[PDB]
């Protein structure tokens, strides 16, 4: 009854949970935890640090990362969150090793492997700085990871959520698409789950976070803006949008648009810490519309916005773009992210370098290196590549093990 | 048995591929170790045949380090004729432990083979998108040259590692004469050489594995003996010329590190490898010429390999470097850590841009990506790049074309691109 | 047009494909293969060897294996196929490392990792025998692997099938359950896919087998015997069984039983090489019923039967059990398998050994060892444990590399 | 900094845990290497504390090799108080390459940690099923003792491996004094010893890693020097007593293999380990007594570890063996390859049964499983065993109990069991 107490208590009495329904008991959670409590330091400090930041910052902008090096540069650049894109993992970082489109094709433990990758890189960055006493950068920046539609049912979602926390994610996002026909937000052929089925996914995620004993941030996303199909008419709430027309597959045609997005947003809002409307373009008016509707029933709900590379941020005007993030943080969009920054950064950079190189050999490469040296004074250390990867950290381990007598120390003698 | 031994025996004596190569074992030994069936390894064969051919056809072949499928994919698209696979890059950002490590054989031994397989599956999906659309004649199956470090242990770990590289579809593999338990990056201190006889055993085990796998995989013998001023032992008469007599606390022996200790190693290894690589501390034309001249006196025409390392300050303005050393026999040239510097510098520049100017910094990259299209860059159309069109073609074939949930038709990539 | 030829030809003209519909062109397959052909020796010889065996044997009985050692003993015992149970992988051999029930909880590339495991063990067994010339056992025995419901949609099935072939499976089985609510055949709460959706999975698998250029054997399984729920009324064919009643989730109540099993079996039969009816008990009468109905429309269709450890093969009579397999091979069930033999073999053996050991120490262990020695003369080599794992094979590699001068050879000096 | 150094410094000087243990490094060094935060490792701590406690409380602790969660799970259920994790078994049937290997460090170095994590996740699910039902008071969190072989390389690979073991929730880890590139099973020929100073460095690196991970993980120093008649080098004065002068082609040195070379190693290692293990070629009571007496003269009460190996013909009928050697100080006793013999013999007996008598052979096993239930065997009810009841309880909590698709109600395990 005492482990149940120090849980039921926190719910009642913690501002962290104001405007959050949990339609299970603290008795249920402790029945599923098993007989002991396992601490998850990284995911707990993470969840706490992201929650603080979202209330103490004007807003928090992130870029997608599909490597720990990529995330380490985000953090050395001064970003205060990391976005783990399911698209990017599908494209270049999943456990199958295949390039896939964004249709839940990869094995469901792929994203959590990348979260652990990122945290292990950040820890090494922290270990190097600590040993040196060379700077006071907090490398443990919260990671917000894509759980797509949970890769199947309520129990897959549960397992996935447990995986994300084990890995040490600070926040996870679930979308109201059908796992079986899941797509990129900015592709056609999207299929919605009944509102109740999307709400059961969100309860599942939170119950998983409760069993793991961690206040992980849960983002509810809706695809209901473009999505004009749904799997069932079973929820009265959705009958308001169905035409009655049906595809061969059996799915139901629906009136997509900001109305459906808004219907989902208010339904999911009592079960999420942030709400996120996938949009087909970066329309300020629609962002404001979407926000207001949520805020009427859910005053000061933290909202999230995908500043998508699937948009042409130029066909949009130049001064509007410089001010977009500040402009939408205004409406309540306190977590903002460029989903595919890492994919475009990675492909653009290697294509331009390989072409410089094919055309002009090491001259081309010396342009990167020189660009690297000029960037040292701004906090780019990766130019000194052996230090960046912790060659100095492992030298110090060798000196401690050998009491200083090692002749095979790496850094002294290096060229 | 005599059946399979003879196809093998024939090819060893007839194919110009194995000219100037010794095998100190027999076809009978190879078939004894193979098992009762022959398993085909299509991409490893086609790659080894293509890489060899292009080494005897091009002025030279120049590569960059790839640490992801996408990176390798942009290298092919831009016109490069091989992919270098850096174990350093894998240590740092792409190994199966998920840790950031320095170049010291700390990662799990099957890591580079995993990245080889990744790269190959990316290239296969790139071809499949091209094939389906009949929209270009690009060969996306370019040879991968993979880092086997010092083999992660002895002669059997080398055997296993060499087999892994080939199953994953590597065309070339390099082994270095360092002690595995003390392995380092070429450009760090505290390198410990293996006795020469021991370095020769590893290249022999490497050739046994490729013969057993029935694939003519390229082997690059690498020596670290330019900067490495320790050897595990005085057992090999050939190494006594360079041993000072001084021992370390650990029991290692001091050697006179230099170009001569490298020339000694290069000539020991040249019979047992298809290319030879001397690691160097600076881009020195006269060391490269002397090392080449020393190798060509005993193996005229021997293919040589040069690491144009990012550990050097490319401020040698006396470019024209690749052409110059290619004229000395250096046909395979690669910038080991290109992938790490590209990825790392790239995100840092964008992230700093982003902190400062928000979505304006993102717009600049998009608009640089559109500008690269005339050069043949397609990743700005990213749904097509990762094969959304290919999986809609799979969907349409399964449903006979009634599929309602096809992806591209009604995507922001149709309207806005 | 010539790679299309040496495909369209095989279909028309190969007995292997008699009574098999492919509702796509050879043009479609070659459009998806890409520009070259990759040989898969193991999966091709496998598919050929299993197909031969099923026509040249009275029938083929298998046991479930969740390790390569387990499969090596099956083969040294004289079995001619191996059954890769999705249940067992869920229980003790999946890439997540968790014990799960049989509800598609594990990552979707888990089963193909176990097929590659098994083939790598068998190859080592073949390499040892070859080197020695000590016996002529064919260790490359066909593996028949569980693809559950494909872990999502038509494209997951496709990817999974490709995975199974890459791994070197000789046969794969897909079931007409909903991936999202998938269960063990012998559990409650089963949910059927529309017949057309189960038929699209099977086309998907075969198209994948066609792109991979391998005549992989495809088993269609139905859960329609116990399963009394279905996801949609969209297929006219299924309206014959729905009551019109609906659960909260939205699913449709159905009249389960041999009639529904038979409806699915004839629907799936033109798209599969074997048909398999999951049954709630080992009823000879129902097995015969099921067979006859299939054979009327599909004369001499190869059928498959799960002799399930979920049955009490004793509450069944003793002489009926000794003759069951021969009895049902009679009706056309030429592929028969004990799904969970490996799970029960593994848990029973370790529990009885640990208890013997707790009670009587090394005396207990010497009973196993003595049981092991008596079993040598029947073809159990694992008693000589260093040879079993290829210590001799790697010694011979060391002698070849060193030209015989090795002083660190393993076997000479062994105790 | 002084904060964290002192909790550490305190515990080293006060806790009876570290009595008779040297650290040749400082708390300051440990905190310098940790990073800026303390990460907790619950199962590694609770396990190390439980294993230590039970080693000072029980006549002795006896274990069998587990190579799967299920196997470990049956060992706990049957009443055993630890699980041995064999690297040999992992080589053979349970490593991350998926190959069958002999005991020679050919598998990927993160393999045993993966099996440690597997076993722990199985035990966690076993507890969760027990907890949910309030149906027994069994402690399923029994200490796992894991094989780190010779570390897969040098002092840094040992450091990394020791960290992996702890993250995965190992309670104890053993390191052996063999050369990694030549590692063997204890009972094969061609074992090559590391110089003593080198074996000591590895146990020091092992303790640094556990101190840095802030967990009191048990370390077992193992010596192979009873049968191993080669050493890599003559560098260590302590080893000159046993070196004959004869060198091998490879440069290894001949040593006088025996109990004396083992006693020399055991006493070198005892200061740097929590238990000491002498590998032996036969179950000899007088060697075990002499080895124990030699260790207890310098470290009275030192905990000792005995491998009751399946490589021996248990026909020593002069059982009562475990009690006898436990009386000599051998508190941790384990049958390394039990899991492999259990799994292998078990399927072969069943498969031969099955070829001969079909489903009658299966019925016998079922009926043996029912007979074991009175002893407390539950796996015959297999849907419950793998937690079908636990995931139906998860389903009911998510749906508030309207779930139609719960699994057990209307299963053959309800009716027929
Ligand atoms: Mg996504
Ligand atoms: Mg390297
Ligand atoms: Mg199954
Ligand atoms: Mg071992």
From TrEMBL, chains A, C:
Cofactor note (record): Can also use Mn(2+) ion.
The terms under GO molecular function for this entry are: isocitrate lyase activity; metal ion binding
The active site of this protein is located at 184
Positions that bind Mg(2+): 102, 146, 148
Supply the CDD domains for this chain: ICL_PEPM
Q: Which cofactors, by name?
A: Mg(2+)
What's the catalysed reaction?
Answer: D-threo-isocitrate = glyoxylate + succinate
Q: Which residues bind succinate?
A: 184-186, 221, 306, 308, 310, 339
Which BP terms in the Gene Ontology apply to this protein?
Answer: glyoxylate cycle; tricarboxylic acid cycle
Q: In which pathway does it act?
A: Carbohydrate metabolism; glyoxylate cycle; (S)-malate from isocitrate: step 1/2
Q: Where along this sequence does the record place binding of substrate?
A: 85-87, 185-186, 221, 306-310, 339
Q: Which InterPro entries has this protein been placed in?
A: ICL/PEPM (IPR039556), Isocitrate_lyase (IPR006254), Isocitrate_lyase_ph_CS (IPR018523), Pyrv/PenolPyrv_kinase-like_dom (IPR015813), Pyrv_kinase-like_dom_sf (IPR040442)
Q: What is its EC number?
A: 4.1.3.1
Enumerate the UniProt keywords alphabetically: Glyoxylate bypass, Lyase, Magnesium, Metal-binding, Tricarboxylic acid cycle
Q: Spell out the family assignment given in the record's similarity comment.
A: Belongs to the isocitrate lyase/PEP mutase superfamily. Isocitrate lyase family.
Q: What is the protein's name according to its record?
A: Isocitrate lyase
Automatic annotation (TrEMBL), chains B, D:
Its cofactor is:
Mg(2+)
Enzyme Commission (EC) number? 4.1.3.1
Ranges that cross the membrane: none
Q: Does the keyword Lyase apply?
A: yes
Gene3D superfamilies recorded: Phosphoenolpyruvate-binding domains
| Keywords on record | Glyoxylate bypass, Lyase, Magnesium, Metal-binding, Tricarboxylic acid cycle
Question: Which positions carry the signal peptide feature in this UniProt record?
Answer: none
GO terms in the biological process aspect are: glyoxylate cycle; tricarboxylic acid cycle
Binding positions (substrate):
86-88, 186-187, 222, 307-311, 336
Quote the record's binding site residues for Mg(2+): 103, 147, 149
PROSITE patterns, per the entry? ISOCITRATE_LYASE
CC cofactor note: Can also use Mn(2+) ion.
What's the family?
Belongs to the isocitrate lyase/PEP mutase superfamily. Isocitrate lyase family.
Record's protein name: Isocitrate lyase
């Amino acid at each position: 009854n005492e482990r149940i107490e120090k849980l039921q208590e926190s719910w009642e009495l913690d501002e962290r949970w104001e405007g959050i329904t949990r339609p299970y008991s603290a008795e249920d959670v402790i029945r599923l935890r098993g007989s002991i409590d396992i601490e998850h330091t990284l995911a707990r400090r993470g969840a706490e640090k992201l929650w603080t930041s979202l209330h103490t910052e004007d807003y928090i902008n992130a870029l997608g990362a599909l490597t720990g090096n990529q995330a380490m540069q985000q953090v050395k650049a001064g970003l205060k969150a990391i976005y783990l894109s399911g698209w990017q993992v599908a494209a270049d970082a999943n456990l199958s090793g295949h390039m896939y489109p964004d249709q839940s094709l990869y094995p469901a433990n792929s994203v959590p492997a990348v979260v652990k990758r990122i945290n292990q890189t950040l820890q090494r960055a922290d270990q190097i700085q600590h040993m040196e006493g060379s700077d006071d950068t907090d490398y443990f920046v919260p990671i917000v990871a894509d759980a797509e539609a949970g890769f199947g049912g309520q129990l897959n979602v549960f397992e996935l959520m447990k995986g994300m926390i084990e890995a040490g994610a600070s926040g996870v996002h679930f979308e109201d698409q059908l796992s079986s026909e899941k797509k990129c937000g900015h592709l056609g052929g999207k299929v919605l789950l009944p509102t109740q089925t999307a709400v059961r996914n969100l309860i599942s995620a939170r119950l998983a976070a409760d069993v793991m004993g961690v206040p992980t941030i849960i983002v509810a996303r809706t695809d209901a803006d473009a999505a004009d199909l749904i799997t069932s008419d079973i929820d009265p709430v959705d009958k308001a949008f169905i035409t009655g027309e049906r595809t061969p597959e059996g799915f139901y045609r629906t009136n997509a648009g900001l109305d459906q997005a808004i219907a989902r947003g208010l339904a999911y809002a009592p079960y999420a810490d942030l709400v996120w409307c996938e949009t087909s373009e970066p329309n300020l008016e629609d962002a404001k519309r979407f926000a207001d509707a949520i805020h009427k029933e859910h005053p000061g709900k933290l909202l999230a916005y995908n500043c998508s590379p699937s948009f042409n941020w130029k066909q949009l005007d130049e001064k509007a773009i410089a001010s977009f993030q500040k402009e939408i943080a205004s409406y309540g969009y306190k977590f903002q992210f460029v989903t595919l920054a890492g994919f475009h950064s990675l492909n653009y950079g290697m294509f331009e370098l390989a072409r410089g190189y094919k055309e002009r050999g090491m001259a081309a490469y010396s342009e990167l290196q020189q660009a690297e040296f000029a960037a040292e004074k701004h906090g780019y250390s990766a130019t000194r590549h052996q230090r960046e990867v912790g060659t100095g950290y492992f030298d110090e381990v060798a000196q401690v093990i050998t009491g200083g007598t090692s002749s095979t120390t790496a850094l002294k003698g290096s060229t």
